[PDB]
Design a protein around this ligand. Structure first.
Ligand code: A1A2F
Length: 166
C-alpha cells in the first residue's frame, strides 16, 4: 500500500503520529480497524471520528448488524464495510478496564487482526477504556503477526510510545 511516513517498530508493526481517519482517507486501505464497543455505538474517539467521516453510514450499517446479530463479545469483532475510508472496517472490542472488564481480553481483541494480512489500526483500549497505552502497544506487538500500521493521534503520546522499551 501507500502507507508513508511510518516508523518501524518490529518486523510487522509500524507506527505514525496521525489521525486514523486522515490516514484512511489518504491510503484507502483494505482494512481499517475501529475501536468499537459491543453495541457498535460509534460516539467518540476513533469510532465517533470514523463514523463522522462516513457521514453516519457506518452507524446505519452497524445498527442493522446489531438488529440481526446482537452485540459483539468483549474481545470480539466483526467485518463491515469501510465505506469511503477503506474496503472493509474490522470493528474490534477491547476491554473497558475503566468498567472492570478483564484486561486479558485485550490479547483476544488483537488476535482478530491475524485474520487480515494488512491493517490500519489504532491502539485498542487506550482511550476512554482506560488501559495503559504502552501496555496496549506491547500486547499488539506480542499478539499480531500480520502487517499492522498503527496511527496514534496524540503527539505527546506518540513521542512517549516510540521512546519506550517494549
Ligand atoms: C491511543 C488512542 C486512544 C484513542 C484515541 N486515539 C486516536 N488515535 C488515532 N486516530 C484517532 N482518531 C480519533 C482518535 C484517535 C489514540 C490517542 O490519540
Amino acid at each position: 500500500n501507500s502507507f508513508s511516513g511510518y516508523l518501524k517498530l518490529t518486523d510487522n508493526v509500524y507506527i505514525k503520529n496521525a489521525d486514523i481517519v486522515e490516514e484512511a482517507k489518504k491510503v484507502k486501505p483494505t482494512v481499517v480497524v475501529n475501536a468499537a464497543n459491543v453495541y457498535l455505538k460509534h460516539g467518540g474517539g476513533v469510532a465517533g471520528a470514523l463514523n463522522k467521516a462516513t457521514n453516519n453510514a457506518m452507524q446505519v450499517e452497524s445498527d442493522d448488524y446489531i438488529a440481526t446479530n446482537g452485540p459483539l463479545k468483549v474481545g470480539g469483532s466483526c467485518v463491515l464495510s469501510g465505506h469511503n475510508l477503506a474496503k472493509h472496517c474490522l470493528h474490534v472490542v477491547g476491554p473497558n478496564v475503566n468498567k472492570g472488564e478483564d484486561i486479558q481480553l485485550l490479547k483476544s481483541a488483537y488476535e482478530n487482526f491475524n485474520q487480515h494480512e494488512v491493517l490500519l489500526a489504532p491502539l485498542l483500549s487506550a482511550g476512554i477504556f482506560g488501559a495503559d497505552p504502552i501496555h496496549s502497544l506491547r500486547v499488539c506487538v506480542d499478539t499480531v503477526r500480520t502487517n499492522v500500521y498503527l496511527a496514534v493521534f496524540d503527539k505527546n503520546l506518540y513521542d512517549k510510545l516510540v521512546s519506550s522499551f517494549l
